[PDB]
Structures are given as C-alpha cells and as structure tokens.
RNA sequence: UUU
RNA sequence: UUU
RNA sequence: UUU
RNA sequence: UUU
RNA sequence: UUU
RNA sequence: UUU
RNA sequence: UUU
RNA sequence: UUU
RNA sequence: UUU
RNA sequence: UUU
RNA sequence: UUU
RNA sequence: UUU
RNA sequence: UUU
RNA sequence: UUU
RNA sequence: UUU
RNA sequence: UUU
C-alpha cells in the first residue's frame, strides 16, 4: 500500500494505493475507514500529528517534515518557472536536505 | 457528519464524511443534494455567506474566516518551507487567533 | 445544469451540476463527453477560448476573464489571510470590476 | 488517449482521457494500472523522470518541463489577476517558448 | 526645478533638481525649506496628501498616483528581472494607464 | 527635532531634521554624535530596541512597531501597485490599527 | 570614471566614481551636469533608454539589461535569504545570461 | 571604525562611521579611499566576494553571508508587517542562525 | 459487541 | 486550525 | 452512420 | 501551452 | 505464470 | 523528494 | 406535491 | 465573483 | 513612467 | 540676452 | 542581526 | 591620558 | 502612517 | 519676542 | 553581476 | 612620468 498526500489548507489532501486493491484501512487522524478499490482518496482535517495510516495490515508513516518538503518543492518549481528545464531539478536542489 | 472546505478560486472545495455513511445532505449555497454513500465531493461557488450544510439531520456551519485560518496555514507553511520541521507549527502559531 | 471552473495548471478544473442528473454533455474544448450522473468532473486542456460546454439543452459559455476574477479573489484572500474576517471580502472588493 | 497533468506537491495530479473509454493503461512511474472506463485519475510521486504513461496501445510522454510551462501559465495569470481580460494571454505570452 | 521621488516607507525619498540652482524651496508636507544649490535631496514623511513642493517659484505637484506607477514599474521590473531584455519594457507596458 | 526612518536590512536609515538646525545630537543604538545643520542622515545598526535619539535636548523614541508600519503601507503600496489611485489608501487602512 | 545604478521606482539612482576626480561629467536622460570631486550621486528618471554618462571624456553606458539582472541578483537573494552562505551565489547563477 | 552595508542591486551600499573621524580608509572591492570626516558612504559593486575594508588601520570584513542575514530579518519583516509589535522580532529568530 |  |  |  |  |  |  |  |  |  |  |  |  |  |  |  |  503506497501513501501520496499534499498539503491542502490547514490538512493534508491524500490517497491511498494499492495495485492488488486496498482490503482494509483506517486512520487516528484522517477521515478514511473501510474493512475492493484499488485507490482510495481521504483527506486529513490537521497536520499538526504526522499523517497515520493503517492500510493492508501495513502501518504507513507521513511525517508532516515530509509533505513541507514537497510544497517546498512545488513552491519553489513555481518560483523558477520561467525557467521549465531546471525549474524542477533547482527546486529539489534547494529543498530536500538529503545528500548535497 | 464531518465537513471539510478548503479555498478553491471564488469559493470553496469541499467534502462531507461520516464513517457509518450519508443518508441525507443539502445546502442553500453549495450544490449538492442527496436524499448510502461515506463520502460526497462537492463544491461551493461563493463563499460570501458562510457555507451551511444540513447532512445527516445536524446543521453544519463553516465560517468563511474558518477557511481562510486554513489557507494562512498553507500560504504560510509553504512560505516557511524551506524550514520543514517548523513550517507547518510556526504557520498554525501565527494563523490562529485562539490561545497564544 | 450548473458549470463551475478553477484555473489549474494551463486549463481549467471544472464540474457539471443539474441538481435533476446530468442527461447529455459535450464540449468543443474540455474533456467531456457523456450522451444518470448529477455531478460530472472534467478538464479543459486549454483556457485560451473560454469555456463552452453544452449540457441538458443548454450552451454554457465561462469567460476565461471570469474565471481570472475567480482566481484573483483567491490569490488576495490568501494575500490577506493574516485578516481573517476580511480577507475574502476585501478579494471580492478588489477583484470584481462590477459595482463599486 | 489523452494525458493533462498538473503540479502537485514534489510530484503530478493527472488523468487520463480517451472518448471510447480506456481499456488499459500502465506507467512506470505514476500509480495507475488497468488491465471499460472513460476516464482515470491518479498520480504520480516524482517527476524527476518525465511522465510515461501506456495507454491503449499508445506511448504518452508528457515532459516534466511542460508540466513547468503549465504552472509558469498559472503562476504568472495569478499574477496579472487584477487585469483579467490579459492575465491568461500575457501568461501565455512569457511563459511558452515557442514562436514569439 | 526637477522633482522626482521614490516611496519611502510610508513616504516618499525626494530630490530637486536645478541646473542653474535652487534659489529657494519649501513645502507643506515635506522637510525642506531653504531662503544656491543645485540639488537638494528631502524626504515627505507621508504621502496620504500629494508631494507639493514649491520651488523657485514654480508649484510642483508629484501625485501620489504617480508614484505608485513608479513603484508598479520597479515592482514588476523585479518580477520580470529573470528576462533583462524586457522585464522593464513590459513593466512600462502594465503600469502606465495612458499607454 | 523631527527624526523619519525607514528599514534597512536589520535595522533602520534615518534623518533628523529642524528647520531652525540640529544643534546637538546623540543616540545609545544609532551612528550619530554631534555636540549647527538643518538635516543629519544616519543608520541604525539594530532595531531590536527602538530608535531612540536625544536631539537638542528633546528625547525621540519611533518604535519598531512604527517602522514595521511604515514598511506594511511601502510593502501593500507595491502589492496594489496596479490600482494606483487606491493603492496608497488602500495600504494605509490595513496597515495602522488606529484605523 | 565608474558608474554604477541600481532601480529606483521608475529610473534608477546612480553615483559616479574617479579616485583622481570627476572634472567634467554629463548625461541626456540623467540629472548631472558639472562642468573635482572624487564621487558623484544622481538619478534618472526614467530607463527607457539606457543610462548614458559622459564623464571625464569617456562614454559610459550602463544599459538597462545589465540593470535587471543586478535587480534579479537582488531579488533572488532575498528570496534565498534563509540559505545566507548560498543565497547570493545562486542568485548570480540564475540572473546572469553568459554563466 | 564601523561599517555597516545594505544589499543594493547585485552588490551593497555602505557606510563607514567612527566618532574619533576617518583618518584613513581603502577597499579591494569597493569605491572608497582617503589618504578627517566622521562617516563615509560608499557602494561595492559586487558581493560576489565578501566586504573588505580597511578603517583606521583596522580590518573591516562584513560576510555577504551576514549581509543577506540583514536582508532576510528585512524580508521577513515585511512579510509580517501586518503584526508590526513582533514581525521584527520573529524575522530575527527565523534569520539569524544561531539563535 | 462499550455507542 | 472545518466546530 | 465520413472514422 | 499535456504532444 | 519469477512474487 | 510520501519511506 | 407550487415547477 | 462560473452567468 | 515625477509632469 | 526671445520672456 | 555589519563582528 | 590604562594601550 | 516617524509621535 | 507667548515659554 | 554597472563594462 | 609607458599614452
Ligand atoms: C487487513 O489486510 C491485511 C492484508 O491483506 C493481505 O494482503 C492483501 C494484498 C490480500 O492479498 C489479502 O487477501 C491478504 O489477506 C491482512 O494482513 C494479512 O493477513 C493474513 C491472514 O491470513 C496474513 O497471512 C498469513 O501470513 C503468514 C506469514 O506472513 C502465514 O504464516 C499465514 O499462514 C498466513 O498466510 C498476511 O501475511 C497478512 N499480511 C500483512 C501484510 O500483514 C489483515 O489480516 C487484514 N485485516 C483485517 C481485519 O481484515
Ligand atoms: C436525515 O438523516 C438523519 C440522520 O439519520 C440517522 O442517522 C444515520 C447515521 C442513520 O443511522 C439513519 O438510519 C438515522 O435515521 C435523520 O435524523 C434521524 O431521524 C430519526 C427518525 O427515526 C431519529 O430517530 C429518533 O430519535 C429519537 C431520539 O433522538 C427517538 O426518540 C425516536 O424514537 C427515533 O428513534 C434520529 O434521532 C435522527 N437523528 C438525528 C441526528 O437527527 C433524518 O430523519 C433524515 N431525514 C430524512 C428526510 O430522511
Ligand atoms: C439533451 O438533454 C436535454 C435536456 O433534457 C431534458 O431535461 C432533463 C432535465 C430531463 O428532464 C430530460 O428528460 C429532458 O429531456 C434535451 O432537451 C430537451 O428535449 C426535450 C425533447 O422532448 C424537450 O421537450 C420538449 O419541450 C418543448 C417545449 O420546450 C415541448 O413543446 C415539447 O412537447 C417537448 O416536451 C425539452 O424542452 C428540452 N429541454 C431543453 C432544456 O432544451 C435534449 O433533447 C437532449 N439531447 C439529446 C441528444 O438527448
Ligand atoms: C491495449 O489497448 C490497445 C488499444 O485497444 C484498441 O483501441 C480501443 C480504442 C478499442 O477499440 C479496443 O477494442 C482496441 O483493441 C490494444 O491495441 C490494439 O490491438 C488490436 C489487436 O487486435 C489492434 O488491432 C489490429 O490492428 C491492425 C492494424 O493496426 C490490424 O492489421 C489487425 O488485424 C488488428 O485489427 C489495434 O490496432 C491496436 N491499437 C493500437 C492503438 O495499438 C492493445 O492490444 C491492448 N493491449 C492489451 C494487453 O490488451
């Protein structure tokens, strides 16, 4: 089960993934909750916690650092975009603390 | 019934979520109505007035200042961005008016 | 049948609504073609000619300028959004040419 | 089959679109995989390799710096909004490299 | 004289210019007052009232309307700075109602 | 005297003035000491502590909290650069709370 | 002699530089004119046209172009200001076209 | 001495101040030298190397890393400019490293 | 089947 | 910080 | 049922 | 300007 | 039907 | 850079 | 079943 | 301010 | 686009 | 010393 | 946070 | 004239 | 909105 | 020389 | 990156 | 007083 959320107002706006379908899913902190789909969109109403996700008897992590990483990304895309060959790359560069 | 908006264009994107299903859902300013899905996707096309949803026989009422608390949290996490473990705790301190 | 547009990338991000189903639908521009649903999400790959969508009997045409007045009251909501209560206001007053 | 991609977060929000309905569809790098709908979404976590999609017996490239071209189209439309007769074109105008 | 100004703050940075000098100058709403130089800088510490500067005894009014096209020019100059060859051009362009 | 800041940086540059002259001037946080002339152009440093200035004899203090406001009308000014007539107006009434 | 702008509102606000002095300097579109200092400021009021100065006998011409990139450099860096080691390094690499 | 800078286009703009006066003062970098006045302004053309100046005798190098410092705690401040009471104070501890 |  |  |  |  |  |  |  |  |  |  |  |  |  |  |  |  694969886990993509973006930032959306105060929360997170998510998804769910699975290729052989997700059979079961919950969440502490994200309006999700089925005991079959192979994609599952749900939305957490706070980040303030790191995003919990109980899907196909597999506990999936989001920390909150993690999605401002990609709005970091985002953001800054959208800053050098004037620039559409390096725009992306520049901003993975600048926001992703791992490596150089 | 659980009702989450964020800011989309002139008005708000929104959902409606109960984890034992929808039964019944309306509202004089967003277009939805139905009279047994957990969750319904719609969209209000103002948000001059605040948004009002009756679902499920509870009244549910989102100030318009309630979304735009939300979207400071997203202009000012992505603004903090490049500080991803802060970004998202320093914009809820300075976008919500309640407590300190 | 109701139609209702945001700018998304180069396009627009657009639904449907007939509160009474939606019976048939095409566009000569947007990715859309149905010959019962109520709510009918859909894209248009380009806003370059407003948008036009023929749904239930009846031509829809969304100004692509109308759809930048609907941006702009979003982009200085969030501009505003340390003011909570008047930010979306205060949007409207500034990016609506009509009236005051 | 047609693919329109936008940015979201570090990666892509994209659909899928055929008027005779898709009857397969694969990616190497996007979470999708069918093996009859007219219309698919999903998404993709990275765009640091450029968005392949196999749908229907057809190859889709779409390059992440077109994806950038989109959001330059949006970012700077935002920009002119107070003027929305021009935002878009002006947009257009600096934000695509071909021709003038 | 010359007038130009740049806002300031909630004011405006100024300078009168005059090749063959500035005899006198005064002002109502900014600091200058002298009764020759040929330049005189000053500033006006709010602009809600338009900059009037009286100088060798011609009226000088810069609008405050005026000053805000200067600051839309340097505004979108900055945002357009990633294209040199046309940032100010195009600036001009989006600024200037009477274009 | 008459003491008008702006930002600069970390701190502030800033401008004293008296039409009659600046006899004598000091401050514990800003470069200037003088112990006549209309007008005296200095900066501060910091403006982690206010401005304050001690100019012939009269104790001047503009808060921080001040210049934060001067530079909100400067920075709302720009943001509303394309609505001229307005846009220096507009500024002023979201800017100071005494509004 | 040496020239040197930066954008200000419309124009640009300029100084002109010669250790052994500036003994004769002029401009078509700039407020200067003398006719020795070792240092001269002044302003143009408008960058329409490149900014132009005769100084010294030489031909100096600072053009536009060469002033947005110096204002992208600007922009950029107070965009990457919380990376201070980087901020101005990586604004030269993206505003400046021959790197 | 005490020099204090200003980021201006692609280099800054400076200020020289001692209270005793500027007996002395040369750069590698930028346009000043005097071989006594209390404050000297004086701009670098570029950052690109940090600011060296010599003052008095005394070595003056203020890091373009400690310039864009200053101008990150002035962009933040406008960007909080519409809380005036801590928008200074919280640009400085987003800014300033070791804080 | 703790609501 | 969707009540 | 103009692909 | 999603090919 | 290489997991 | 969604683990 | 006020359209 | 999606007509 | 300082008149 | 073209006002 | 100009050392 | 505390270097 | 420099008091 | 209205403090 | 003021030539 | 290297132009
Ligand atoms: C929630 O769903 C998970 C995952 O479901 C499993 O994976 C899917 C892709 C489908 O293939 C499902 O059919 C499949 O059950 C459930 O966890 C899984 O539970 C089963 C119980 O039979 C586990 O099988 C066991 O595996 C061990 C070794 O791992 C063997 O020794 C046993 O003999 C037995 O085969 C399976 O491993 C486990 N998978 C994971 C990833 O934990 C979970 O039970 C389910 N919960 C509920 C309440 O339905
Ligand atoms: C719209 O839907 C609401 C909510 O539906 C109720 O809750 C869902 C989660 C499901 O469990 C539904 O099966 C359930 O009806 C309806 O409101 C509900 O109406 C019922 C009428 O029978 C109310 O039950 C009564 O409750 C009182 C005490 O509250 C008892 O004294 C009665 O004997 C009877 O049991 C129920 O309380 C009420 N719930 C709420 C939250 O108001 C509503 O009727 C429906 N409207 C239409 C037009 O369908
Ligand atoms: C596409 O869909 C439209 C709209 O469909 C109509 O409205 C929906 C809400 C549902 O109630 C549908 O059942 C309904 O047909 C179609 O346009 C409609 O076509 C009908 C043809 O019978 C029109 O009815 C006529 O109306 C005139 C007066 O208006 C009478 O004199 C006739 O006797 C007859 O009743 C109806 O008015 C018309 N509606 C509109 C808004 O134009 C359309 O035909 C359909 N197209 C296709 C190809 O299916
Ligand atoms: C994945 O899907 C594609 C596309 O599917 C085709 O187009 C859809 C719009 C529907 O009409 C489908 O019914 C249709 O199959 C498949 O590619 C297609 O495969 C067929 C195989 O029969 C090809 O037909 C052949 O075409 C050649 C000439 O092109 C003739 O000489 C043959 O006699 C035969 O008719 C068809 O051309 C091909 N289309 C494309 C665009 O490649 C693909 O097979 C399928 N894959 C899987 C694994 O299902």
């Given at each position: 089960c694969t886990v993509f959320c973006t930032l959306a107002g105060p929360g997170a706006s998510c998804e769910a993934y699975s290729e052989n379908g997700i059979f079961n899913i919950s969440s502490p902190t994200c309006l999700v909750n089925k005991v079959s789909e192979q994609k599952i969109n749900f939305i957490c109403q706070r980040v303030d916690q790191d995003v919990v996700v109980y899907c196909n008897g597999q506990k999936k992590v989001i920390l909150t650092k993690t999605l401002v990483i990609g709005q970091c990304i985002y953001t800054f895309t959208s800053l050098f975009s004037?620039?559409?060959?390096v725009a992306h790359s520049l901003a993975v560069e600048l926001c992703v603390p791992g490596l150089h």
């Amino acid at each position: 089960c694969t886990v993509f959320c973006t930032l959306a107002g105060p929360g997170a706006s998510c998804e769910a993934y699975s290729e052989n379908g997700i059979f079961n899913i919950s969440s502490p902190t994200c309006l999700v909750n089925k005991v079959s789909e192979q994609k599952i969109n749900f939305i957490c109403q706070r980040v303030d916690q790191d995003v919990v996700v109980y899907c196909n008897g597999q506990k999936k992590v989001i920390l909150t650092k993690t999605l401002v990483i990609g709005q970091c990304i985002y953001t800054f895309t959208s800053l050098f975009s004037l620039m559409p060959d390096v725009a992306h790359s520049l901003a993975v560069e600048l926001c992703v603390p791992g490596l150089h």
